[PDB]
Every structure is written in structure tokens, then in C-alpha cells.
């Protein structure tokens, strides 16, 4: 019913539950459409920071949400 529950992510979570970790370096595309990518991860990005995906596209992280970053 909500984004960031893609069942890669939940399983990644179960495996590392007894852990501490900061995913702040890299974040994995959740859904692309109409010129917008939603990204799971990127815990350390700041609003307006340019982020670049694989194949070279550059994007701006305008929306930072708990589940994902638009």
C-alpha cells in the first residue's frame, strides 16, 4: 500500500536486523516514471543535492520522505 516495501528491501532488512548500519552513501531506484525517479535509500542526502544514476542521468532530490527520496 506504500512505497519502500518492495520485498527486496524487506528481506534485506530481515537479514540485517541485528545490526546497525547507515545506507547514506548510495540509494536503489524504486520506480521511474514521467521524468521522476523514486529512490529507496540515500539517508544522508540534502534537499536540492544533485544525484546521478547509472547511465549518467543527473537528478535533484527535491522530495525527501521517510520511505524514499523523489
Amino acid at each position: 500500500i506504500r512505497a519502500d516495501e518492495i520485498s527486496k528491501i524487506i528481506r534485506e532488512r530481515i537479514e540485517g536486523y541485528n545490526r546497525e548500519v547507515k545506507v547514506v552513501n548510495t540509494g536503489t531506484v524504486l520506480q521511474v516514471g514521467d521524468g521522476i525517479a523514486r529512490i529507496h535509500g540515500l539517508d544522508e542526502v540534502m534537499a536540492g543535492e544533485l544525484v546521478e544514476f547509472e547511465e549518467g542521468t543527473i537528478g535533484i532530490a527535491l522530495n525527501l520522505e521517510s520511505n524514499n527520496v523523489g
Binding site: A3, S7, V29, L30, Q31, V32, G33, D34, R38
Partner: peptide, 11 residues
């Protein structure tokens, strides 16, 4: 394929 939707399905 208009948009990738996540959970490995397109729209």
C-alpha cells in the same frame, strides 16, 4: 511501457 512501478511490474 509508460512507467516502471516498482515491485517488478511496469505500467
Amino acid at each position: 511501457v509508460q512507467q516502471l512501478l516498482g515491485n517488478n511490474r511496469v505500467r
